[PDB]
Amino acid sequence: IPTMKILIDENMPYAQALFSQLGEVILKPGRTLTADDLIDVDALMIRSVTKVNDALLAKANRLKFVGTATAGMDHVDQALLRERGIFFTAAPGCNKVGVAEYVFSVLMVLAQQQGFSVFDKTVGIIGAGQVGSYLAKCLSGIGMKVLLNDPPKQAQGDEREFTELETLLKQADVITLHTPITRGGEWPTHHLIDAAILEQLRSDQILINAARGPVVDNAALKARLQQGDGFTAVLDVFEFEPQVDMELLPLLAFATPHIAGYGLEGKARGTTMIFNSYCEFLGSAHCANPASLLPKAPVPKVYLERAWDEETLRTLTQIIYDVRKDDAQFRREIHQPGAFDLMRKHYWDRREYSAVTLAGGADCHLAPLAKLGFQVEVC
Amino acid sequence: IPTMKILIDENMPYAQALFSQLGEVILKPGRTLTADDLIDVDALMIRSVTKVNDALLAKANRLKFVGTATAGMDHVDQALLRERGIFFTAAPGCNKVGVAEYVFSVLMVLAQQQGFSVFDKTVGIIGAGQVGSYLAKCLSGIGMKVLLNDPPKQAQGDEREFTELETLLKQADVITLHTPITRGGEWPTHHLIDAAILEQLRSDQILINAARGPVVDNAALKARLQQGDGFTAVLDVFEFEPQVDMELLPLLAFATPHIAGYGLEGKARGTTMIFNSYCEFLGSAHCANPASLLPKAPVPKVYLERAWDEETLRTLTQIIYDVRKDDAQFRREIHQPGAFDLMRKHYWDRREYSAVTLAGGADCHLAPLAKLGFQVEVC
Ligand SMILES: NC(=O)c1ccc[n+]([C@@H]2O[C@H](COP(=O)([O-])OP(=O)(O)OC[C@H]3O[C@@H](n4cnc5c(N)ncnc54)[C@H](O)[C@@H]3O)[C@@H](O)[C@H]2O)c1
Ligand SMILES: NC(=O)c1ccc[n+]([C@@H]2O[C@H](COP(=O)([O-])OP(=O)(O)OC[C@H]3O[C@@H](n4cnc5c(N)ncnc54)[C@H](O)[C@@H]3O)[C@@H](O)[C@H]2O)c1
Ligand SMILES: [Cl-]
Ligand SMILES: [Cl-]
Ligand SMILES: [Cl-]
Ligand SMILES: [Cl-]
Fold this sequence. Notes:
The PDB classes it as oxidoreductase. Chain A is 33% helix and 15% strand.
């Protein structure tokens, strides 16, 4: 029987098991892919390590489909793909779930450490794409007040209610960034949080940047933190990572090596999403989800005796992710050579709220917890 | 129908509900009890706020039984009680459970923060009474190596295998204190951990004192910590509490205001134990337990998919108690007037491992977790 010839990155998780259903699978390390590797190849499945150039496709005589198991697609010349009719797809938002649960962990722990309620704090989301909109969904789901800012999408006709920047920077208690890094365009994000903005940030305001490094001027962030007025900053991304300011590090409430979106589920969605895309491209009925591929969580379900309070919410969410874990490892190991990248490479088997089932009675208020991302079960 | 007349401290938890089954209950604040209050009184149930003097019993014409809902009994002249035939009982070990789970939390978090395995660390218990023996049971239950030291009990004929002090101080990684505070006697405990001992403590050794304040010379503890060689100390009790050395405080890994044994269950055991004692004293069949009196825990049961690792153990135990919570509040509030005592008075609804049921399959290894204190259920 004739089959499609599918070239796939060797280290794409669950790739062989999934795509073998769709035809002949060739597994090769993505960094060493040459032009000859695409001879007689119908479809290509890659990660970020493979650059889709003119060079790579020089002998792609059968290439009709290209899928990248990533949320981003800068490693792909998609103007090239477009001009020669090659269908292209990524996995947008494949790792957005982790970021939301990362931000929530940060809020939850800071609430405990500084002694306040998260339901008193207004979160301002700058960047309402895949990541921001999911975070906006989760926070609003449990009844927190969100503030969305997005000048590009608002100009494109997005009819969500957007808050203007200077308003958000004043009206919001917590400021979280979820934008790309851009120097040009109508709405550049390089040093979006600059010196002038930082010094107008109050002592009871929290700044979180788990978007991209250069969005926050790290030098300016340090200067703002060295006043010691109680201003609070959390960085998952650094302006010149893997290098970080070792003077700034002990001033940051939490510091982690670009691992907010990490997690087995999100990593599996990379493969899962482009697999479903290619399935649909072939006209196949096959369909896959990360829940089916992964083993069940260590603590897959817990039971609730009554309705949840803020304390129970902290208890439940920290079963999955506690930001203090990564923070501690990062500070402990960063002095070691290449520890920034090695910590990411050997990241632990982190899950997400969907891996855990919350079982309760109709009087336990699980509907907000379901919107937060948990699986629920009314007894 | 004739009944026993029972005088009880107004603020003893669940006292009226329990003891009303045994006869007439009179509720009066323990600090304001006078001699006249014991006229025609058959039994007395008190806390620490009531001092049992010659003065208090001056008109106790019917007093036959005295119960104090405490583990200690220094507030009681029991030489007086003995010489006039009054049966006396306390509630020994009523709050020992919390201390063990406190110590374990400290070990669990320090293991995460410093990056090590608790199953690599040998815990040396100094003081093998109610508290120490329960801790020894819990740690050995999950497979940790314990080291018991107790010169008084060893001299009295206790045939457990005891380790000599200087040996324990060298052979053990973690040193936890669970002794009373004594200046005299054959085995005094005042400054038991002194200057000479502290300076022979290694950089990879941990010292925990949740026993009594003056057992550790706090001034010497500070001097040892100011070297910055990596030595680690945790205090639940301070030499001159509620006053603490504000120079020592930021050097302590964890600092809490004498709340290790706190928890609803332990607090209820105070009433429960002396109630059962008095029941037995009357020849009654009535019997009570704190589990029946308390509401069920917020998260009363969780399920396990597989056997537990060290990470899962941390996840499970921190559902009940996470020492970082109290530590954060203590450091945040201590500057406030009387915050040391007020934090204890308005302590949160803390539980214990027995309040949570761990459900799994026969292959989940719950037997050690049961010995740790959890309720288990093999499916
Ligand atoms: N730290 C992490 O673990 C982690 C993980 C994944 C993604 N990210 C970062 O997520 C950002 C969000 O990712 P995404 O997948 O949602 O991409 P996205 O493009 O869907 O989202 C960003 C949103 O950015 C808006 N935007 C662009 N410029 C803006 C500006 N100047 N002001 C306000 N909004 C602006 C975009 O138009 C859109 O509204 C990127 O930096 C992404 O790489 C971080
Ligand atoms: N921090 C807390 O929350 C908290 C709570 C309850 C009790 N405690 C402290 O517990 C200590 C343990 O309490 P307990 O109820 O088990 O009392 P206990 O008398 O049963 O226990 C202490 C054990 O102390 C041994 N001991 C006395 N001197 C010793 C010495 N010099 N060296 C080694 N062992 C010695 C006693 O003989 C016994 O073996 C007391 O200080 C108790 O008040 C602390
Ligand atoms: Cl596979
Ligand atoms: Cl990108
Ligand atoms: Cl009562
Ligand atoms: Cl005492």
